Amino acid sequence: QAVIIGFGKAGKTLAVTLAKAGWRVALIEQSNAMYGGTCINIGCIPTKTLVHDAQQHTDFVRAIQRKNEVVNFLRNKNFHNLADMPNIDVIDGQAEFINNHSLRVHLEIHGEKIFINTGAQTVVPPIPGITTTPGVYDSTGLLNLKELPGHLGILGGGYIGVEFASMFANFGSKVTILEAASLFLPREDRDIADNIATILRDQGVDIILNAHVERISHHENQVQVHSEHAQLAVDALLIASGRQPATASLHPENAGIAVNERGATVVDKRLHTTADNIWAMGDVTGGLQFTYISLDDYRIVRDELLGEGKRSTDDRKNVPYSVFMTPPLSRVGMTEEQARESGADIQVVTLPVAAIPRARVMNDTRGVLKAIVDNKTQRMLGASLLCVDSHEMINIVKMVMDAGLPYSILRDQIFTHPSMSESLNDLFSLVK
Amino acid sequence: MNKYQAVIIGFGKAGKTLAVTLAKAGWRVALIEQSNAMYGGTCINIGCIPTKTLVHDAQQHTDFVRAIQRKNEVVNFLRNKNFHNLADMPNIDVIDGQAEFINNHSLRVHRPEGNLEIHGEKIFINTGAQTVVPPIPGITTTPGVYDSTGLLNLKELPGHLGILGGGYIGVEFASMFANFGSKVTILEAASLFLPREDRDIADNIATILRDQGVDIILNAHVERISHHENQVQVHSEHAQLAVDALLIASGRQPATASLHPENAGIAVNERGATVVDKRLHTTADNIWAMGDVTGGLQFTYISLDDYRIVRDELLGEGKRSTDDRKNVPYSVFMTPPLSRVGMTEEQARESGADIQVVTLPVAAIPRARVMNDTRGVLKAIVDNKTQRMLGASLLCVDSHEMINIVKMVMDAGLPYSILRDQIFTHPSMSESLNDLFSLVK
Numbered sequence A: 001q002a003v004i005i006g007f008g009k010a011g012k013t014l015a016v017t018l019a020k021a022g023w024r025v026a027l028i029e030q031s032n033a034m035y036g037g038t039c040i041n042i043g044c045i046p047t048k049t050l051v052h053d054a055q056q057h058t059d060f061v062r063a064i065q066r067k068n069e070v071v072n073f074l075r076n077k078n079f080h081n082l083a084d085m086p087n088i089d090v091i092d093g094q095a096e097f098i099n100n101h102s103l104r105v106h107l108e109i110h111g112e113k114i115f116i117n118t119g120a121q122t123v124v125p126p127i128p129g130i131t132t133t134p135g136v137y138d139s140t141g142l143l144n145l146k147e148l149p150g151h152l153g154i155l156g157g158g159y160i161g162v163e164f165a166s167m168f169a170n171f172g173s174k175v176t177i178l179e180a181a182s183l184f185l186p187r188e189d190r191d192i193a194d195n196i197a198t199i200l201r202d203q204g205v206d207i208i209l210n211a212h213v214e215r216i217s218h219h220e221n222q223v224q225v226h227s228e229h230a231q232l233a234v235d236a237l238l239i240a241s242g243r244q245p246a247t248a249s250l251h252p253e254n255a256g257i258a259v260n261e262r263g264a265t266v267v268d269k270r271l272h273t274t275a276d277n278i279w280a281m282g283d284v285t286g287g288l289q290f291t292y293i294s295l296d297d298y299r300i301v302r303d304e305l306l307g308e309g310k311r312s313t314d315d316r317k318n319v320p321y322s323v324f325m326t327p328p329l330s331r332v333g334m335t336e337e338q339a340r341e342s343g344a345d346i347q348v349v350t351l352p353v354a355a356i357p358r359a360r361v362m363n364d365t366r367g368v369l370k371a372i373v374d375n376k377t378q379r380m381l382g383a384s385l386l387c388v389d390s391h392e393m394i395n396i397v398k399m400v401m402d403a404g405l406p407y408s409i410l411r412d413q414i415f416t417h418p419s420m421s422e423s424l425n426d427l428f429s430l431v432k
Numbered sequence B: 001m002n003k004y005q006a007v008i009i010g011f012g013k014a015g016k017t018l019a020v021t022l023a024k025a026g027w028r029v030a031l032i033e034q035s036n037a038m039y040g041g042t043c044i045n046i047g048c049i050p051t052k053t054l055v056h057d058a059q060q061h062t063d064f065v066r067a068i069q070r071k072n073e074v075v076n077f078l079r080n081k082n083f084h085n086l087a088d089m090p091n092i093d094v095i096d097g098q099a100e101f102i103n104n105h106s107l108r109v110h111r112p113e114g115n116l117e118i119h120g121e122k123i124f125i126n127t128g129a130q131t132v133v134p135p136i137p138g139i140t141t142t143p144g145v146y147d148s149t150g151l152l153n154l155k156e157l158p159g160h161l162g163i164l165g166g167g168y169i170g171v172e173f174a175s176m177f178a179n180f181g182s183k184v185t186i187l188e189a190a191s192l193f194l195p196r197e198d199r200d201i202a203d204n205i206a207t208i209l210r211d212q213g214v215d216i217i218l219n220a221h222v223e224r225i226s227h228h229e230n231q232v233q234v235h236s237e238h239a240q241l242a243v244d245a246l247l248i249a250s251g252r253q254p255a256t257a258s259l260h261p262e263n264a265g266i267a268v269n270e271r272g273a274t275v276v277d278k279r280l281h282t283t284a285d286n287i288w289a290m291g292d293v294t295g296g297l298q299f300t301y302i303s304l305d306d307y308r309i310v311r312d313e314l315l316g317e318g319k320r321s322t323d324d325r326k327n328v329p330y331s332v333f334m335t336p337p338l339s340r341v342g343m344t345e346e347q348a349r350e351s352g353a354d355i356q357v358v359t360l361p362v363a364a365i366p367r368a369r370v371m372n373d374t375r376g377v378l379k380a381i382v383d384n385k386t387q388r389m390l391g392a393s394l395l396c397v398d399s400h401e402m403i404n405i406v407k408m409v410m411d412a413g414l415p416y417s418i419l420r421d422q423i424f425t426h427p428s429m430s431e432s433l434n435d436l437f438s439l440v441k
């Protein structure tokens, strides 16, 4: 049999695939408000359901009301897919590791093979008054706000923080981003980060860099962010401090599973841990915190268990990602700073959004297009697409890079019209 | 004037692109355009851009006049940008006037202030198409009847909009005006709604349109059109229907009669189209034809590929050809839009191949719920002997983008396994291709 700890993209997908091949499965989930995983209940689906409602400038609580019915439908849906296959017991409890072989859930469960899918949890910065102060929420709590705050304060200049910054700005709120680094989006090209910042500055969002946050109070109906004799008064404070793996009260030392400093389970290329028949897929690995990467973790584990598995984590070339601001930033491959830091000489090519007629059709001609081409192989090394529907058209750049095809096939491709993917014709035609 | 090394007839997609590429290569180029409201081509002014601009506003239930106001701002910005991007190059002469073939070397441009004569070492026909008018009495004189061009310039949203034509452009206008709050009645002469598509997706499109108020009637031979008292009356077999405005969506045919191609040795078929090579060579030497005037598929990206053919001949590297075209995609811009590539299930059944047809309802795509439009369906056809994909039917929101992903691996001859295992962005509509081709046995 098999036991998977945690309703997650890899966990629920492995549980259904195992059940259809004849395995007795037992998936353990601690919350009935988390059927479907972090993505379905408090992650992508609720965040981008509201992001889509913000770019239309609809009422904020009417959109929260609608986010509540899209997550409620999907929460019932994902529990329906799991319990209506006979093999899968759904144990509504929080699991604890007794040894390699058996698990204790708050009932003790024995398993021939265990698969860890507990995901990650929000980390709090050790700032005095961060928990003692009302009006202070993380991403989950902020998604359940009862009224639109007039002034929103965000601790963190991360991708999750920029999403909510542009999301609430479109709703009608003043947003202040408090970032500690010297650069906005330090993991990005500076021409791209300059554009994102300018788009946010035009919607009222102040980007405060080198932000020193000493304490956080509550005084006169508002939250106060102390900063060495300078207080910023906001009506609600979101904290985008990133998430770290959730291997605390699993007590994974009992099973002999080595953990690194951040709490992530040390895992193999094919997702084997230190213990003999234990696996860990998803954010708990410590890798990229994406829903698609966790699904591929199921692909790696499934090939081992049900085929004969060549599948490895050394297969994932060009993992793309998107920051669902408005317009969304999609990125795959290296940046200009990375391509220049290595030996191969490159040519950078830029297409402004003003030259994309489809962006004019959709009433948002903001952002720019950018890509890097290797003059030695005519291949593509990276792309930064800051435009409407960039999350959809970046999949085309990633797929051609996977097959190692040159940039010319995108330069000469017959696309659909009018589309955003057809601007790739205009993009890679500026290459020489 | 002098003799131009290249003379292009029309501001179409291919010609306006060839003019910039030849002027940049040193050629003395002249482009003739018969209308100063047609700078930039049919698409920019009366085609894709104003149509889709309104559909995007119609999806938001925006007031019709405000959307027409924004439609005007978009067509007028790109018309002025498309004119100046040509008129600013020194080697390009944008010549207003209606061109007419005197010879295979000279043209007669018709400007009301006295004619001009223009000669060309090479001449490129790029006149596009024009509305087909069915032979129904009282269609030219009745005031409430409109073409596709005239309907996009309406001043008031008609409470009941009638469409003559079950074609793709008509269905596009069906959703657009039914989104604005109008009752629509599309009348198709054939006995099947969208007969070139599958019945399963044609049925899905009909019910999506029906729940929005669109009435679909087949077996329609309209015999007279009348204006009696403020509403257009169309008389039929045994019944009659009255609408506020009547739109003719009966297809477009090449516009060549006023070009008079016979005087240059240029052959034409009975549709009115110029006959061409796989290199877009007309029967007369040094005369090319590009775009919808060729009788080919009426898309902007096919006219763009036509420019690629002729640019590969005039500027080197031997020759590209229209024989290079395979798996040409298209999209019907409803809500949700219908995008397609490859063969339908109907054709795949008849082929006799060992096929597998997978079906995924859009209600199972979480990103479609994120956008409040879980309508439509996904379906594709897998060939079992080769593991390749023969066709796809993407009836979803943002179908016009991810259909280019399906066309990608079909051109490269890759199996369906590529899209079943690719790491797509999330949440996305392209990622559902992971779930769509997981249904393959």
Ligand SMILES: Cc1cc2nc3c(=O)[nH]c(=O)nc-3n(C[C@H](O)[C@H](O)[C@H](O)COP(=O)(O)OP(=O)(O)OC[C@H]3O[C@@H](n4cnc5c(N)ncnc54)[C@H](O)[C@@H]3O)c2cc1C
Pocket: A005, A006, A007, A008, A009, A010, A011, A028, A029, A030, A031, A034, A035, A036, A037, A038, A039, A040, A042, A043, A044, A047, A093, A094, A095, A096, A117, A118, A119, A120, A139, A160, A246, A249, A250, A281, A282, A283, A284, A289, A290, A291, A292, A294, A295, A322, A324, B426, B427
């Ligand atoms: C605000 C926000 C926005 C995001 N946006 C995106 C985005 O745009 N794109 C993207 O790809 N990702 C995004 N993510 C990340 C995404 O939500 C997750 O990374 C994804 O769900 C990965 O899931 P997983 O496979 O790691 O399993 P998880 O879903 O992380 O598994 C956690 C589940 O296990 C349960 N669990 C934990 N411990 C136990 C235990 N001991 N016993 C029983 N059950 C337990 C939890 O209750 C929970 O249900 C976002 C996350 C957040 C917070």
Ligand SMILES: Cc1cc2nc3c(=O)[nH]c(=O)nc-3n(C[C@H](O)[C@H](O)[C@H](O)COP(=O)(O)OP(=O)(O)OC[C@H]3O[C@@H](n4cnc5c(N)ncnc54)[C@H](O)[C@@H]3O)c2cc1C
Pocket: A416, A417, A418, B009, B010, B011, B012, B013, B014, B015, B032, B033, B034, B035, B038, B039, B040, B041, B042, B043, B044, B046, B047, B048, B051, B097, B098, B099, B100, B126, B127, B128, B129, B148, B169, B252, B255, B258, B259, B290, B291, B292, B293, B298, B299, B300, B301, B303, B333
């Ligand atoms: C309602 C509608 C919707 C459409 N939607 C789409 C869609 O979604 N996607 C898509 O790919 N395509 C679409 N099309 C098709 C698209 O508009 C055309 O296929 C595209 O513009 C290609 O045209 P062309 O290059 O052949 O020349 P055109 O763009 O048609 O250019 C013709 C030009 O030549 C000029 N001209 C004509 N005769 C003469 C003459 N004798 N002398 C001088 N100048 C002359 C005209 O004034 C005009 O400016 C649509 C068309 C319509 C009508």
Ligand SMILES: [Cl-]
Pocket: B325, B326, B327, B328
């Ligand atoms: Cl084809």
Ligand SMILES: [Cu+2]
Pocket: A039, A040, A043, A044, A045, A290, A291, A292, B426, B427
């Ligand atoms: Cu997710």
Ligand SMILES: [Cu+2]
Pocket: A055, A057
């Ligand atoms: Cu806006």
Ligand SMILES: [Cu+2]
Pocket: A084
């Ligand atoms: Cu069921």
Ligand SMILES: [Cu+2]
Pocket: A106
């Ligand atoms: Cu306890």
Ligand SMILES: [Cu+2]
Pocket: A108, A109, A110
């Ligand atoms: Cu037991």
Ligand SMILES: [Cu+2]
Pocket: A151, A174, A233, A234
């Ligand atoms: Cu304030």
Ligand SMILES: [Cu+2]
Pocket: A226, A227, A228, A229, A230
């Ligand atoms: Cu102080």
Ligand SMILES: [Cu+2]
Pocket: A248, A249, A251
């Ligand atoms: Cu404990």
Ligand SMILES: [Cu+2]
Pocket: A417, B042, B043, B044, B047, B048, B049, B300
């Ligand atoms: Cu067009």
Ligand SMILES: [Cu+2]
Pocket: B059
């Ligand atoms: Cu609606």
Ligand SMILES: [Cu+2]
Pocket: B080, B084
């Ligand atoms: Cu001007």
Ligand SMILES: [Cu+2]
Pocket: none
């Ligand atoms: Cu001669």
Ligand SMILES: [Cu+2]
Pocket: B221, B223
């Ligand atoms: Cu008749």
